[PDB]
Amino acid sequence: GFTDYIVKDIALADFGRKEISLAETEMPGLMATREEYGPKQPLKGARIAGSLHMTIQTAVLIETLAALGADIRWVSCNIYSTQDHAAAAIAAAGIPVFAVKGETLTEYWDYTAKLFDWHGGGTPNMILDDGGDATMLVHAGYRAEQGDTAFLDKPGSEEEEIFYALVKRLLKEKPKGWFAEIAKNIKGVSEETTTGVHRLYEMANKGTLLFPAINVNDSVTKSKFDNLYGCRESLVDGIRRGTDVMLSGKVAMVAGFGDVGKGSAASLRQAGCRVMVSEVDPICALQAAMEGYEVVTMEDAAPRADIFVTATGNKDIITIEHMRAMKDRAIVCNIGHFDNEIQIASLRNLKWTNIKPQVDEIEFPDKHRIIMLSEGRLVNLGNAMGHPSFVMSASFTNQTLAQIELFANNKDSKYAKKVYVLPKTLDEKVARLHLAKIGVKLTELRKDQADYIGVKQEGPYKSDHYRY
Amino acid sequence: PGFTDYIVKDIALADFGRKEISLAETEMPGLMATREEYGPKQPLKGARIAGSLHMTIQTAVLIETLAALGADIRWVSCNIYSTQDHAAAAIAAAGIPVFAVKGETLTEYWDYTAKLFDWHGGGTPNMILDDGGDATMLVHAGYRAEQGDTAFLDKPGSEEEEIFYALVKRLLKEKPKGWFAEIAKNIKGVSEETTTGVHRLYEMANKGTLLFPAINVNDSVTKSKFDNLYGCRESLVDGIRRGTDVMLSGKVAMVAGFGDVGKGSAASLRQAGCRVMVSEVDPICALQAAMEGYEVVTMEDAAPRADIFVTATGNKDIITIEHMRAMKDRAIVCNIGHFDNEIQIASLRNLKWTNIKPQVDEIEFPDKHRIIMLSEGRLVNLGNAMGHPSFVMSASFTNQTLAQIELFANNKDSKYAKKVYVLPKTLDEKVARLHLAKIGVKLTELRKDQADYIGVKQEGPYKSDHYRY
Ligand SMILES: NC(=O)c1ccc[n+]([C@@H]2O[C@H](COP(=O)([O-])OP(=O)(O)OC[C@H]3O[C@@H](n4cnc5c(N)ncnc54)[C@H](O)[C@@H]3O)[C@@H](O)[C@H]2O)c1
Ligand SMILES: NC(=O)c1ccc[n+]([C@@H]2O[C@H](COP(=O)([O-])OP(=O)(O)OC[C@H]3O[C@@H](n4cnc5c(N)ncnc54)[C@H](O)[C@@H]3O)[C@@H](O)[C@H]2O)c1
Ligand SMILES: Nc1ncnc2[nH]cnc12
Ligand SMILES: Nc1ncnc2[nH]cnc12
Ligand SMILES: [Br-]
Ligand SMILES: [Br-]
Ligand code: NA
Ligand code: NA
Known part of the structure; x- marks a missing residue:
């Protein structure tokens, strides 16, 4: 035994x-x-x-x-x-x-x-x-x-x-x-x-x-x-299982355009989204622009995008001030290795309503909500199958x-x-x-x-x- | 002065x-x-x-x-x-x-x-x-x-x-x-x-x-x-259109090589509507091409199939006289690598050339099938368009x-x-x-x-x- x-x-x-x-x-x-x-x-x-x-x-x-x-x-x-x-x-x-x-x-x-x-x-x-x-x-x-x-x-x-x-x-x-x-x-x-x-x-x-x-x-x-290509296939997979949202016609924001951010932007674009990207690296930003991605700041994207994906391996990419500005029921997730790309702890005094495993709705003081996937953990592994x-x-x-x-x-x-x-x-x-x-x-x-x-x-x- | x-x-x-x-x-x-x-x-x-x-x-x-x-x-x-x-x-x-x-x-x-x-x-x-x-x-x-x-x-x-x-x-x-x-x-x-x-x-x-x-x-x-x-992605098809005015949607194109030039060339043709096949000797580069959904084949597989052929290797003797004998009537053949020996142009001098216009020639084979050659096998993007x-x-x-x-x-x-x-x-x-x-x-x-x-x-x-x- x-x-x-x-x-x-x-x-x-x-x-x-x-x-x-x-x-x-x-x-x-x-x-x-x-x-x-x-x-x-x-x-x-x-x-x-x-x-x-x-x-x-x-x-x-x-x-x-x-x-x-x-x-x-x-x-x-x-x-x-x-x-x-x-x-x-x-x-x-x-x-x-x-x-x-x-x-x-x-x-x-x-x-x-x-x-x-x-x-x-x-x-x-x-x-x-x-x-x-x-x-x-x-x-x-x-x-x-x-x-x-x-x-x-x-x-x-x-x-x-x-x-x-x-x-x-x-x-x-x-x-x-x-x-x-x-x-x-x-x-x-x-x-x-x-x-x-x-x-x-x-x-x-x-x-x-x-x-x-x-x-x-x-x-x-x-x-x-x-x-x-792994992220190209598994990012939208995670989003679909978590939210069942129509991707065609929506605007998505991907923070980062390294290997993971490139695959992430491609996942959303191939699924029908119009994809914008942020970058701090001028070479990677020029790559994103030459591929036809609009390159903007997260401040610029926060009021506009329907979906946000952090893909930087950095921290404090999507902050509480960004989430205060987001439209009602914008989707937020993370595909970098660690969850601190999004300020998940700044949300904890807010009302969280659990929808299903690894999917939560979070309500703000002025009544707008956001949909958080996997509490900011790796979305492709948390909400789908990697x-x-x-x-x-x-x-x-x-x-x-x-x-x-x-x-x-x-x-x-x-x-x-x-x-x-x-x-x-x-x-x-x-x-x-x-x-x-x-x-x-x-x-x-x-x-x-x-x-x-x-x-x-x-x-x-x-x-x-x-x-x- | x-x-x-x-x-x-x-x-x-x-x-x-x-x-x-x-x-x-x-x-x-x-x-x-x-x-x-x-x-x-x-x-x-x-x-x-x-x-x-x-x-x-x-x-x-x-x-x-x-x-x-x-x-x-x-x-x-x-x-x-x-x-x-x-x-x-x-x-x-x-x-x-x-x-x-x-x-x-x-x-x-x-x-x-x-x-x-x-x-x-x-x-x-x-x-x-x-x-x-x-x-x-x-x-x-x-x-x-x-x-x-x-x-x-x-x-x-x-x-x-x-x-x-x-x-x-x-x-x-x-x-x-x-x-x-x-x-x-x-x-x-x-x-x-x-x-x-x-x-x-x-x-x-x-x-x-x-x-x-x-x-x-x-x-x-x-x-x-x-x-x-990106340069080749924009100027390869530009060269092919100005030389031939052919419809690219519906056609099968073959790109030899999947380095930087071959990547941009295959993308040029795919974006223009072609179904693109690729050859490679490097297994990593060939795996990249297949993960992008390109069929990876040999030049011998492609010779009787493709409507358009592009050499992009920087190597030599990529498209041979035997390949061109096998091509369908009026296939388009060109080269976007730096030198013109990717294609055996010298071997083609033996046949009947009819000049169409500058940098565009029709070449006829013994069985009367023909091919269209761009820029005599020199850089097609700069010979046939504007680089x-x-x-x-x-x-x-x-x-x-x-x-x-x-x-x-x-x-x-x-x-x-x-x-x-x-x-x-x-x-x-x-x-x-x-x-x-x-x-x-x-x-x-x-x-x-x-x-x-x-x-x-x-x-x-x-x-x-x-x-x-
Ligand atoms: N979920 C998965 O299955 C999976 C797979 C591989 C890697 N990862 C992880 O994803 C993260 C990213 O990996 P990578 O290989 O793409 O690294 P990378 O270095 O190739 O790319 C990261 C990019 O983020 C950019 N960036 C950094 N700070 C930024 C900021 N404040 N705003 C906008 N852009 C910024 C960088 O310029 C860089 O180009 C890592 O944590 C990595 O371990 C996850
Ligand atoms: N026309 C232009 O504007 C332009 C611009 C840049 C470079 N070039 C030229 O294009 C050529 C290619 O450059 P590159 O940057 O892509 O080099 P590269 O090394 O990145 O790519 C060449 C590829 O050809 C492959 N290859 C070699 N022999 C082969 C064969 N017999 N069959 C199939 N594949 C084969 C290699 O594995 C390699 O991946 C060079 O000669 C370069 O000077 C032309
Ligand atoms: N399916 C998977 N299994 C293990 N690690 C992974 N990382 C990303 N996807 C994975
Ligand atoms: N337009 C161009 N001018 C100069 N060199 C080039 N190489 C490729 N295209 C070119
Ligand atoms: Br608020
Ligand atoms: Br013959
Ligand atoms: Na899996
Ligand atoms: Na030019």
Whole structure:
């Protein structure tokens, strides 16, 4: 029997299994990775602590890791992103998983801590992260365990106080040197998303990064696929399920025109909205204008737009003064990694009327209302099902290759305590594994053609500086 | 005083050229703002710039920006069909030496290139501004042979190659001993516009044969992600319509390559109503095309199917004689990469050509099926229409102007070695900012805490050097 898990309802396991099987067909990169590396067992002996949205897509990633020999414990990286049938299927598979759609913030962080209590005794020796939270727990406890505890008493956020309480409690409950023990045993971390990678470079630059990191976000086959087309498909998906609103003929405002903001603006435009964009980057703003988006300030958009999407990875994008100016029943959501892009806490003395899970109506003093999705959390994961499997297969094949490099291909210490990206050969290899399913017929260079443009026939085909 | 130091189709076109230059000025705020900012400061006073770059109206605005900054100038076009004759006439009528005719011969093309280096008043140039690297390459071949390596000069390859070798020997015969070493020593740098030219530069740098510092303007974000992409999106179909007047809605089009030019070319045709198929050798680029809903096929798959074919690779031997034998009657074939060997045009000389109009030819095969060829396989957007529109050229040419300033005025301490550089992101962002007012953008300003929160200064730069946009 198996009891080392927390999920919503284990009876959803058969439903999750059915959808996982369907996803496998949609994820040739992961399936082909199992076929190539399965016999090789490169992950035998790995103890991977995973912190990433516990979805059906993630379930295929987890079982790819296992098929390569990895021992695993897993949590979601957001309180609303778990798909409970995915989590149930992983638990029924005998993998410790702690993930519930709609868990509390305190549950979220205690579940993260369970990553590090390994079954059979000990600690993990790998981390797979999305947003850096698990990585941040190891570094925060380590910093405190070494005596610099001052920051632990100086919070300024609901989440951050809960997080600091976790770190104190772990220091009080766990053996000496538990964080030093963890930090010693972690061979590396692979990080999924822009915000988490930002956290890594803050540690790298300060000289506090405790183990090698691979930046999976900046694989071309991640950042130019997941962030772009993934959001192009899943943003309006989340809006439709939450609101069932007609998109044709409405005006939408997207804050940000990086990879996520580009995909977000395209999602709304393709659905029929007239899309305006904000930006602070003059290059990205010129991109938005040349694509036919009107580029305006949030002050300018607030009285006018029917729908608002923050996509910046920054904070305080949609403020309480913006929401006071919005038309009655304007829709507001967030597709960046963290909820502080919208001033959700400034709304809490207002009347909230819940409509359905992850959909609330908020009334202002002058009677106008707004429709908030997922309380400002990631709308594509909170209100729909995240990115579809196929594009997630590209991201998670990168993730698996990153795990293999850090765990198995660091005998010569080629990875120091810095942040790395996968080589272009592996980036191109990820793309190759997805060509058959979509029906691409790749042209083969002749040798004189390859010489002509200065590449080998087998690649890589571009300079490391190429932007695609 | 009278001015005679030029070669143009017809100098009576100058008033016409001047009118369209004036209109282009309004569409190129980046160059006009650069004039306002740098004119008074005269950063290129003393510069003698040899320019090899499509002699279009857009280029004329660049020329007069360089002049307004203090530069002394001589200019030629970098393709036999890309010149706009009214633009060349306006530059000549302004007293600027220029040698460019739309439809010039290959022999004329290289003879005019050599004329850039005989400077009015005596002497040589001290700067080069290049598009494709022909002018740079004439210097390095001449220098290389002036040193002693005479071998390569007696090996053809194509028709152009033979002519090009013939020029350097004539220049070795007629000019004083040491002429090329003396050019090479006075050239303070070169700025290069295009992907093929930059590939030529890096190949020289890796071989240790690059003679002077070089700035890769192509790989500024405000160039490659705008000019190459949106420019071709607007001027490819423009070239096809003017050449053929064909209905694009309903047709199947094939684009070879899905780099920046291929991306913009496929978009040009899709937006015009075509169903677009694409070829690629790069699996990442091919995956991008398929995620945009383009069918990714081989040129052999497309030959009997597509109504229109566009090569956009910067490679060679993309559309072969075997492909063209397979094409349906009166398929349209053209090329938007920098050089004309993407299509095996030489192989087509064997068949019966009927000229339709300038830069449009019908070619008949033994079984009587025919194809329509645009610009004899040269750059279709510049041969058959007017190249990229002014506004997107303003970004590219502001980059060129800043690159000329860097190499001519900001290299007193040799901070630029004999290597290939790109412009800093601060200048890349600068270029974009100069175009925001014209296109109506209202930029948001970060507050101090928001700038700290994402790790940037309020005034930028906003992205890591690794950022792909
Ligand atoms: N929901 C998802 O499934 C998903 C997927 C990938 C990434 N993300 C997250 O989305 C966020 C954005 O990621 P990204 O890859 O697009 O990063 P990015 O750096 O590529 O783009 C962010 C853009 O926001 C702009 N910006 C910053 N502050 C702004 C402001 N005050 N006003 C207007 N624009 C501003 C920046 O100039 C930048 O161009 C991150 O938090 C990332 O982790 C979410
Ligand atoms: N006409 C214009 O106005 C204009 C403007 C800019 C650049 N150019 C020229 O266009 C050419 C392409 O430039 P780019 O910036 O797109 O370079 P790029 O490297 O970004 O794109 C070229 C693509 O061609 C692909 N390719 C190479 N050989 C191939 C083959 N045999 N079959 C299919 N695909 C193949 C490469 O994989 C690559 O993705 C260059 O010569 C450049 O100088 C023309
Ligand atoms: N479906 C998904 N699964 C996991 N992480 C995701 N991030 C975005 N979409 C996702
Ligand atoms: N109109 C134009 N002028 C100069 N160079 C160009 N390259 C592409 N289009 C051009
Ligand atoms: Br109010
Ligand atoms: Br035939
Ligand atoms: Na999904
Ligand atoms: Na033009």
